[PDB]
Design an enzyme around this catalytic site. Sequence first.
Site, short mmCIF file in Angstrom:
data_model
loop_
_atom_site.label_atom_id
_atom_site.label_comp_id
_atom_site.label_asym_id
_atom_site.label_seq_id
_atom_site.Cartn_x
_atom_site.Cartn_y
_atom_site.Cartn_z
N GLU C 247 25.83 9.47 4.91
CA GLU C 247 24.32 9.73 5.47
C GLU C 247 23.58 9.33 4.33
OE1 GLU C 247 23.47 13.35 7.66
OE2 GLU C 247 21.35 12.94 7.20
N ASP C 280 20.26 6.53 4.29
CA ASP C 280 19.39 6.30 3.37
C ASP C 280 19.32 6.46 1.90
OD1 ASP C 280 18.20 5.96 5.95
OD2 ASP C 280 16.75 7.96 5.73
N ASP C 283 15.86 10.38 1.34
CA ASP C 283 15.29 11.16 2.51
C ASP C 283 14.47 12.46 2.11
OD1 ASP C 283 14.59 11.98 4.99
OD2 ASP C 283 16.81 12.63 5.67
#
EC number: 3.2.1.-
Lengths: 544, 544, 544
Positions: C247, C280, C283
Amino acid sequence: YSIEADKKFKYSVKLSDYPTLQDAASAAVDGLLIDRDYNFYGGETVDFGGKVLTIECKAKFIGDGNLIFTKLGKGSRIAGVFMESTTTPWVIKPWTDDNQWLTDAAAVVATLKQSKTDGYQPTVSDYVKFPGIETLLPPNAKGQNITSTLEIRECIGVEVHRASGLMAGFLFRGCHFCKMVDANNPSGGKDGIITFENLSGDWGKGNYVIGGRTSYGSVSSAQFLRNNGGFERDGGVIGFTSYRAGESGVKTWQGTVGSTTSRNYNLQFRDSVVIYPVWDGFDLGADTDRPGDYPITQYPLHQLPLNHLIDNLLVRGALGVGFGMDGKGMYVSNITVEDCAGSGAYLLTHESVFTNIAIIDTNTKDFQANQIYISGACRVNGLRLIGIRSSLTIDAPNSTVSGITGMVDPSRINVANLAEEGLGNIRANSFGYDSAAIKLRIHKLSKTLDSGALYSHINGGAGSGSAYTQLTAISGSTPDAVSLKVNHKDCRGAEIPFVPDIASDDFIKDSSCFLPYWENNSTSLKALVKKPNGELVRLTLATL
Amino acid sequence: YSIEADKKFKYSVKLSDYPTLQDAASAAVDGLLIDRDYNFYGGETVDFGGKVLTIECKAKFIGDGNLIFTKLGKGSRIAGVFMESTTTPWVIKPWTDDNQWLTDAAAVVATLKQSKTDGYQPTVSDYVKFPGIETLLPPNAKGQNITSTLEIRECIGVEVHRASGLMAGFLFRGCHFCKMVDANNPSGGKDGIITFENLSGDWGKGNYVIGGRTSYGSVSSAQFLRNNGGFERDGGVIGFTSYRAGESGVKTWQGTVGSTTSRNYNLQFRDSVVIYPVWDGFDLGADTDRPGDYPITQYPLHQLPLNHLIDNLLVRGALGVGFGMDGKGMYVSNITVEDCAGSGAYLLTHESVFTNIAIIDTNTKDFQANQIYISGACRVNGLRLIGIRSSLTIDAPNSTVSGITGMVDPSRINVANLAEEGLGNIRANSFGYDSAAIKLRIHKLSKTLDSGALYSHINGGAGSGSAYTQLTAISGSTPDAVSLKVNHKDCRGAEIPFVPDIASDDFIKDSSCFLPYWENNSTSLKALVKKPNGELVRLTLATL
Amino acid sequence: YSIEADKKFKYSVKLSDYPTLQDAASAAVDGLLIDRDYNFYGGETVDFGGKVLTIECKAKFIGDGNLIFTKLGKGSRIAGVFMESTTTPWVIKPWTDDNQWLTDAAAVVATLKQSKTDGYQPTVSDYVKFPGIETLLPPNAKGQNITSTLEIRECIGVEVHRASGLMAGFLFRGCHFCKMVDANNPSGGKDGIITFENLSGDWGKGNYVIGGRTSYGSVSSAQFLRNNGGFERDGGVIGFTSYRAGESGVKTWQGTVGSTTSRNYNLQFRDSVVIYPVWDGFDLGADTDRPGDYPITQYPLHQLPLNHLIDNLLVRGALGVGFGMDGKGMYVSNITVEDCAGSGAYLLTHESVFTNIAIIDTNTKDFQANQIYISGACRVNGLRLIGIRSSLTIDAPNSTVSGITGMVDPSRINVANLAEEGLGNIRANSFGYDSAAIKLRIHKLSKTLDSGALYSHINGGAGSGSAYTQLTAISGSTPDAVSLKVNHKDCRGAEIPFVPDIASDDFIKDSSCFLPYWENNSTSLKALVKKPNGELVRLTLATL
């Protein structure tokens, strides 16, 4: 009690209890304390039996040559090692009491002294750096080879912490996942101070220099041979400081060493500082066939997909080049180079991007033709030039540049294209002058003279509330030779230049325009007119 | 068993076995474990006999005053020390629940409470910072002197790791090659939190603050007195964070202390952060005769060849000055200062270069006359001004600047010379306006009014595909008063301004030009012509 | 001897002497050595009795699930922990042998293999990232949940050093003043690799990630839930590197988790690097009512006074967004984002300042509408755009920007206001062209065409010493359609455009000016004159 004791105390063996290092190593189970100075002979090898040990050094290893540690278990750590040669060699000190570099061979020879620090043993590269020195150096100062080296051999997951020493060297041969952490300012010897060599076996990976500090040494402070950090960029130099490297601060080797490649790929070079190297700050090149590496038919010279992660580096006082490298498709960022004798940056790169680069007061001894040189088709975004000092400044023939700041001499800039495409509304602010200006220079016409300008000049003096605007064009290599003025002497009218003689048909350009010209024999102003239909006609404009 | 045991176990003595710290120290051979709280009396001195020990602290040293450690062997390390005063003093807290600074003496006095943290003991400098407070403070809150200090005395190669404490202080007196590593957020007392003092003996060298974090304290968090890192720049502050210093984040002392100089040379100040100091972020000045240092006849005040290596510093929320220093021939780079109450930068430097400096929203409480002040003849390359907030912004009378970015008010800039010599082809892009502009301002004429401009204005509205270009000049302190237009109302012609009356001979400037003027009594346009031979003649240009 | 021994040796218990981890823990007094692999069952909890211990790991903890450490005394440190799952799950590897990202669901499914590293277990977010993959993945590769997690529970002042592992995770639940230091590249599992969760009890404080390195993992590498560093900014991520997060590299959670807020305030995010995250780089958003947090009536969505200290971050190769965040009144500085597939920066900020931001070659796969997006009324000072690659580049409707550098396409810029208020005397330098130019573009009129220009063109060729200056205006959507020239063909006169037909009264603008126009039926040039008194009169200017 014996059982209770064997279960409640920390195991550690200490050197003072054994005659040789190997006897201590064989006895070790958890910790190993170096509590007395140990004189080793070059080539002395210690086998650690694959044990995961914690070696705490509170004494020093003395000897010329290598002390080879082998078969250390993954997870092993050595802290506080101090290496010291037994020999006190002859060292030169190419700098003065004011910290000025000495470049004259005779002056350098005069600095000769026997010491284990504050200088370095001449090496063949010095014959190049200080021309004539090979002839001036006495035989006992030539070809010296002193280094007290800790060689970690073919180990994995071994870290060396807070190392130090005099004429000291640290070599990881065939290692992986090893780290040189927080080097406590070891003073180098003839060889590299921190070397990760992987000429045999697999390409080195996981090898790092983290947070160190080194001083002197005859060659490079930190160097890598045949290492590849992979896509993960597992390896490199982070948070390191190098003082007075005899060659360069950090170096990735180039070309063939032995019968294989010594090049490096996918390493990190960040947040590090290099000051006063005799040669370069950072030497990140790979090319100087390539056995063991990519063929030239695949990647031409200087165009290897090196892929290093380079960011936030500072270089100051290099006698050589501040930052040097080669490669294709590289991304480099936040580099600051100040007060160097040779070029601030020598880049043999192609299809690469350089973002926010500051090259301040470099090439101060005119060692090279420019402060920054770029070989291939590259892009520079943000380039700061010129500090407090006054060759070309930047020669990057095939590069496109944007965002240059500083008191650069325009005639000393050579690039493929220079542009500021996205500026907003602009204001030119002039200080200490009677005028403000916006000059235009077509380098194809002339690199030294401006071809036109838009000026604003004061009428009267300060606080007059009046100024005149003039639009100029160069003629006969005399800048501002022709010009239209608005408000000269606060007259509030436009002063317009006319052709000093009969205007030739080809002088007028566009339709629906007129070009005033002089007719001396009638003392009249005429007007060559190109009607809106394209036809030319000459009219009388002003007469007596 | 005894022999076997003496050879296979790690030696370590623990405090709980001895009545005093000295008894434990004398018994120590390798390790020393502080396993129980120890109450020391001020001045209590421990002699370590030159032993190279590893002191592991798992308890705290309690007491007001100094606990002096002496004769620690080179290589010694102390980890996890926790210093705590026995006294809970009266502390002020000059900030509110929204983290806004309180500057009113009465409001500050009202914050008084007895605590060992989250505030600091008033000091005489507070009488200056919050005027009137000396009169408002109750006697029991004045002249307090609480600090639980670990004093390392005249030792070499001793490192202190992960120190902490309440009302804690750490003092290296006469030390060399010592380091304060990874300070674990000690809360300071009356004295400096980390101090390297070398007023006696040799100039301090090799002393560093590496990776720390400190909070509060009445004076500076990290400070150096009479230290010289030499050309190698061996000493300084790297990777450190200082929160809420009662005075400044990091400070190099100035002037004479006792009967000798307290100044510092050749230190590194990099990659560090200072937030919310009551006074300055970084106070790197040396001058405020100089016994023990360079004479004024050699180096005038504020012109010492300090030579510090300064790079990558961030300062935010100082009630005083963000970054301050003095010196000659200094190179400073990559400084970021944001949201400060006093000046963002106060520079009493001469012949120095500042590269890539960002001074954002500072002098927010108008404590000083400007956001950035530069004394001498310096060079600034890349200067970012103005964040989100609206005195001068920059006053650097003898400095040459280039590369300013931000929404600065031009009238608030004062420099010796401002220029962009190396820009490429330019485009001014205008947003949210009916025109684009390139304005010229001669500050000698006026700092508030533009003297001329080149505008582009829309004809009609959006998407008309038409605009007019106008060239203007100021007259009678009315900007744009005179102007030539091209394509006004899409007419496709040039509108030209003429002298409103008979033009005087001196109005025309160059040869081969003409200046139209009005002759009201004949309703004609005349033309003052200066022939290509320099002679003037008046011609009729346009009539009825 | 027993007494002598009990007083002179270091206490340490070792796992190999006990059957379970708890038996070793109960026996421990100072040190604890993990000298043999230990297979734990999920949920296995160890109570350390509040002892301040030093756990040295030289072996590994094996098992799927959590190994919970509780009641560790303040000051405790665990070093060298190695976590490894017992299960070898199915992992995908969304990148090719050339390090190119794979975005096609089928191509990604084809990378399936059973391994504990060099890939990651698909998670529901992958169904979004690679659309269609949910349907293509075999059932045994879906819903996997493997992670070998070291859970530190409700402890204070506990540090974890040099952790590593395969399918490894580290969770601090309800902890304070804890640190994850120098993570030795653990390969992540299904859960976050380093997580500071404080959903219960007090808001987390003093929790840091310092100097790490992690690789892979299915979700974010470093993440915080309900942490508040306070005004002191005690907590966050400093000097950390994240490789290939499933992620994001570092993430502050958003919205409600369980029945309370998971948001974070006053944390530091500095000197860190994130490369190749599937989503990302950073984040740092908080918003996605807010139970347990500020109400929307107080702070609207995306407008929380987050107050993080953000500086010096580098992001490269994100498949998602390089740098993303939200908030009000934020100060962000020195961010470098390069070569990303999605936006380089997605900013839902209001009343915030961004200083020295470099967004180089991002949104390369057109995943978003722009390279950088800013929501609210913000200020950008220094913005570098465009590297080596060619949607909008920047869409920041309500932001004021200054200092853009790079080869940006002007038509692709949308901001509220763009300006360079403080430039000095200017010079436009043109390379490789026959002209130099300063163009003006009113984006309200047209984003694609320049509305006017000031050019300098060569007359003849190189080295002629002549050029002409021309001032242009756009008409009929044809740029440069109308223009005045000075020195065309070295004629040394001004060529002036006149209205191609009878000029209408409204064409002339100012008093004391004249506008030449054509009268075709008499082959004469006339002049619409607006006298200095404002009255209009038409005069004859030039005739046959």
